[PDB]
């Protein structure tokens, strides 16, 4: 079994109006999928987390490496395309596109063998997830707080069991947002908070210090991602549990936040901390101290059903009668394209959203849907 | 004055065979270059470091948040940019395409105040300096240890000062080079080893041991760049110092491997660590403790001018009389587009390198040059 | 372009009254200015923070190394000096001195290029701060409580946005002058504390576990600069977040006090911590851990300016919209010199200053107020 | 008993061509006494290590808290003058001139009670120390290696047991140098070596393993005084103990450098580090740690009578028969007023220096030679 | 001068009732002074902490090399003893022993040069302190809980500002004695409280969290004074300062102590801790990081002597107006030898005692006392 070709496809999808996190201005969906086929016909299917173009960019440049290689053999590859571009690597770009490589071919494997990713990772735990709402972004002239009020009673009444807010823009407003929020989801629905690194330390643990009351199960990218000793100062110095790692890569990026005392919940990406090879040596770094693995998840439905995959095969950490388990972060923002890509949608069911079981992935690309959502040529 | 455009040039030209380091075998000179335009006329270039088609994609991706922006204002461009694309960042292909970016800004900043790049940095210590040569790649069924002995004692008949050969390979025949070159040689011209961090930890500490009767004067990248304890154990272990830093990115990396005590030496890439902004802040980091920069430059004339420009502003550590100055790493591979981008060859003259003294990088590019060994389309 | 002349011009205006703080008894305002000319008849200008004619007699030690050096090449000129008088400087007056050189230095170069010195500095993030109020001084039979109370309603009346009162004298009645002070400006202005270094350990984590319900944003110098244990024990032990770095020096102190985690805010004055030249490198640092910068402001319009300089051009830490930013700290007591050195003064209207974007400091020096407070000779 | 008078006499005597260390060049010998007069007629005499006219500005701006002041009460007059110049003081000249106050109370306080200042100091242990001769400076068209050599063996039959040489100018002449100075004194004669701080950290350990077999007691600031971490690795690199304190200042930063392990030997000098009462308390620290103290010494007879009565009370670490004694750094080169400045010299006679033992310091200025010396004004 | 004997003298008188602390349960009060007598006359006089007969049987091995030697040289003699017998020394009865010598010999070196010892020591910053008076023991069919409230009501009734009740029975009966005291003393009066290493750290944090409410000024000797690791658990593990130092001895004692975070008191006893000469290096080291020395005071109105010179002669950390300054510790049960020992009695006046300024410790022995009370033989 050899790979004969190596494809990416770049998808987008203009808004309404641009969407602002505390992190980022954009003003359209756009992701980039990886297609690998062999010389048998089989064909797997993968994603990149962050820019698109730069991703489909770098998987052409490994693609050399690629094309006459053995897919089956997913350790050497990974090590290979990471040797190979890591000098100018190492984080980031070089870590995102080799995870989408990964991903496609864990599904060639799957389908060689005749088994789904979760069963080669190892088995099943679990076939379902419970699914949490992530929320709206800022936009212009739309007030935050009751439309975040709104929107999270809308979540509420779709019967997700939490939802995660977007602040990071300023102590008092957040606040306000947060507050409302609370009031609008009932006294039982989880609630989280995610700053996209937009605060200072002190605004970071002056924002939890006074959130905290209103019962916040965890804090995610308080600070930047690369300040270790501020996200441990934010730990330090407020209630709310810490979180953070969809921007950080790699097993030697999340052992530096890890070592730091980071985080009490550690989030890689599977499209961007490089796939599944490398998220299960970041899943057993985390058993080294006790700390929580709850996977980022932010993309297609591929990067869904490939983050359904590993959440099936995620270890207990402690194992005991009914666990504490993996739950899957749910974007609910507008993007035709999301589900248009996969012939079955992966949606959530009154909160829950249950994981394929088919051989590799346990998807059926829609071809279609890649051409009806092509990003225009530049 | 505001920027207009920004373009990137592609360079490629193949070669007889291939050339082989440790670290990766390529098979053409590969390179690119980055071009801004201004409202005014003004024209800055840059150039960044490791693989080209992708660094091109990232610098149009940046090319969002260029246009209109006033390119006198290079700390907040830098701030802005990197924040930017900061998630799926941080290392790699982020700062290296930012580090192009940033020096055609620095050179648009010094043609508009009328100053070389130097004197912007706070002024020229030096006026030229002396030049490494480096040595030749592994080639098929070449013999490395009297391809080497030969070459080197034709950089010693130039005029060079001193050579670093490649290892990384195997200490048996590594130790077997180093001994032909040394004896090539004489006694007197320096001699400098880069393993390409092709070595375990084992075989870069016994090779040191081994080598060091040879009169060496760094070991360069003996292990990869993400063990930054293997670093120190190597450093702690042999005798020859320890060099890094071409592999590594801005002054968060940075400040990892200076606080890991990984080298003795860091060499910071012009076109790789964050470009001139970043660098200067690299080389304040490195005074704390007292480590001495070497810059690491490999790439076309327009490199050679960012790292001279760089060169003549660098502030001994220690001032003294006669002080520790840094050397110009020189390859001297075929690569017929080196200096063919540049109007003005920047060439050593019995080894050393006279610094411009031009408005910005002080150079004019040869836009014909730029056509003709323009990389053929995908 | 050479410089020909250094000179230095003494100010004092005694006091109706003696001015205490916990950490100092002054009768007289007294400040020094450096006045920098050039062969081309550039004349720069600059201010040295602390005792004015030790200051005065530094700068005169420095003039030997100044005198036929080229001013625009102000990395140069600052490590050359600073390695003069090392051997018994490296903190205090030899970086004080070397600070209103400094400043001078990078007036002359804006003067040069034709660019204000916050462009040179790499770009203006903001054209105005928002200033925050000093407070008075215990002087002999006024009550502090009173005192304060009114006084900081008075400011709290011209549109300051915050103020910060000074204490370090006694638990009990800085509490009582906290109390009153919080009262009197109403609950939404911004409240900061300085102690200038006058409480033991317990007394400032007594203070600050009592304080922290008046909504105090900063406790400064709560302890003696040398003790950097008992910085990090008082940021341990109580809420209040810590200020410090008026009376700590250059790259090397500065790091000293990172590295202990002694502050929350680091606060480098212009003119006494080695100038714009080695304020850009203590920012660099702060960025390493993420700690705030916010400046220390005391003296004449010739710091003001400078001040205001190096604040436009502060990159936020964290980049996001809306970011914090650099307020001012404006002493309003009684100095009839404060303006007057300026042809135009460098005010406060309704809370914010707004910047120079002249060439260098953007003023213009009124020599005849030099002559007017000319300190009397001894 | 009150101070009634503090004046600062300033000496200077031209070279016929300047003397050159790594650190500095000068063209004169230039020093600064302290003179500090009381109600009763007593009168004590001090000396400041350091820039002279920068010296006695910071003694005139201490002045003021002496006036007036029992000088009997050493402790608090340092802790009180301390406390006041402390915000831009620290280290350097705000220490260098407090030591010369201190020194002349010290002196007033030994007459005052009938009493030598190794008594008070509580004790004599010797009542004469070996003194060790340093070399000459580098000058203008002089060859180092013979000058030192021929310097030495003058030295040599003169009677002293040790010389110590100034390196720091280039590895390579500078071992010239040493071996050199080594084959013209013989094998018996101990050597030392000091770089001024001249060197790399790379330099410095490279001199260290190849000086090691000359047979060296100490090599005294490899390294710039801030970078500790620099000496720790050069006292960790090579064979040769390493020394240093003469750029270091008060408890604090002598603490600093001992706790980071950086020396071998601590060379406080009694007129730079905080006089008689901050050099018992260093001398306490070194005791923690088991680290020799050496005083440096550099000035004039007043300055040598004050490191005479310190040495004399210096307490052995251990104790012992026979123990480990301070030796007398003892400047050789030329300086007619250095001897002059006393009615009666205090000089080697076969390499030995009596310790005085009348009140004070035991000695008693001539008034004419500070008249027949006085610097000109300026 | 020389000593020519050294003679010790016990005191003894036995209680009506034994008295308990959490440490000890003793039925006499049984005390040792130190007498040393030199050939001109002097006399001077000392006490040792701790078990008497042993004191007077370590003086008594001491006294060998004490005949004969200057007294005046006190620095000197508390080397050589110290040494003499550190093999089977360094803590403890050795320590104790040498402090009775130590302060006769500074109350011989005061009347040999007219001076207080308090002067020697470096001057007198106060000239009275404020003691705090201690609480009763323990006693059989008395209930610690009314016995504690009354008698400290007649302590406040008698002036004294302060109090400290003994502890470490029991957490419950504890703080019901606490609390009691509270109530009887008002809510003015500080309040201290002192465990006698009597808790595990358990029962010292429990009690601490459930006592700072009211309003405890410092937690004495929670825990054993070995386990240093235990008294940095309690000061982080409860709010109220820890203090200790009475069972802890020398330089390397107190630094082991300091360095270990475990007080922010540190309470040397005169008569424990090595005497005036090792009790100026203790404070010393409480200066590195800021912690504050209030001595601990246990015993003869010789003692009390001793002690109020070094309170004389503390320096403030920091030198601030109105500093914190120490208070005296003042045992009020039952000794009719504390004060006969003294031919004028060292006295609290409402509250405050004032500091003898005669030659020595400025007190005259009454030996009709020490026959008066002389310990019985065996
Ligand atoms: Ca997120
Ligand atoms: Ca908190
Ligand atoms: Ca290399
Ligand atoms: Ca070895
Ligand atoms: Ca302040
Ligand atoms: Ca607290
Ligand atoms: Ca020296
Ligand atoms: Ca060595
Ligand atoms: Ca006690
Ligand atoms: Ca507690
Ligand atoms: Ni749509
Ligand atoms: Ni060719
Ligand atoms: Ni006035
Ligand atoms: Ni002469
Ligand atoms: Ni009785």
Redesign the interface.
């Known amino acids: 079994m050899k790979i004969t070709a190596v494809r990416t496809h770049l998808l987008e999808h203009r808004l309404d109006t641009p969407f602002?996190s505390?992190?980022?201005?954009f003003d359209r969906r756009a992701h980039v999928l990886v297609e690998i086929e062999c010389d048998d016909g089989t064909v797997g299917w993968g994603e990149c987390?962050?820019?698109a173009?730069?991703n489909?960019?770098?998987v052409?440049?490994y693609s050399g490496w690629l094309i006459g290689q053995d897919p089956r053999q997913t350790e050497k590859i990974w090590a290979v395309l990471y040797?190979?571009?890591?000098?100018?690597?190492?984080?980031?770009?070089?870590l995102?596109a080799l995870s989408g490589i990964d991903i496609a071919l864990w599904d060639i494997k799957g389908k060689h063998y005749g088994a789904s990713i979760s069963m080669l990772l190892g088995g099943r735990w679990r076939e379902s997830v419970r699914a949490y709402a992530t929320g709206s972004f800022k936009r212009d002239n739309v007030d935050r707080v009751s439309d975040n009020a709104s929107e999270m009673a809308e979540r509420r009444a779709e019967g997700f069991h939490a939802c995660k807010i977007k602040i990071?823009?300023?102590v008092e407003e957040d606040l306000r947002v947060i507050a409302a929020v609370r009031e609008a989801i009932g006294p039982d629905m989880r609630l989280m908070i995610d700053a996209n690194?937009?605060?200072?330390?002190?605004?970071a643990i002056t924002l939890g210090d006074r959130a905290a009351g209103f019962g916040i199960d965890w804090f995610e990218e308080p600070?930047?991602?690369?300040?270790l000793?501020?996200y441990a100062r934010v730990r330090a110095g407020q209630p709310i549990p810490v979180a953070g790692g969809?921007?950080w890569?790699?097993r030697?990026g999340m052992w530096?936040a890890l070592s730091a005392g980071a985080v009490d919940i550690l989030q890689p990406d599977l499209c961007?901390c490089g796939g599944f090879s490398e998220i299960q040596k970041i899943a057993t770094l985390a058993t080294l101290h006790g700390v929580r693995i709850v996977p980022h998840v932010w993309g297609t439905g591929v990067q869904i059903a490939a983050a359904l995959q590993f959440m099936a095969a995620m270890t207990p950490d402690p194992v005991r009668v009914n666990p504490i388990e993996p739950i899957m972060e749910f974007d609910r923002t507008h993007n035709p394209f999301r589900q248009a890509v996969l012939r079955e949608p992966l949606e959530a069911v009154n909160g829950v959203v249950t994981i394929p079981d088919g051989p590799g992935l346990g998807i059926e690309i829609n071809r279609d849907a890649l051409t009806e959502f092509r990003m225009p040529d530049?």
């Open positions: 602002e505390a992190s980022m201005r987390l962050g820019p173009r730069p489909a960019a770098v052409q440049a040797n190979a571009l890591r000098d100018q690597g190492q984080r980031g770009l070089s995102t990071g823009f300023g690194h937009g605060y200072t330390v002190t605004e600070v930047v991602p690369e300040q000793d501020a969809e921007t890569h790699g030697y530096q961007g530049p």
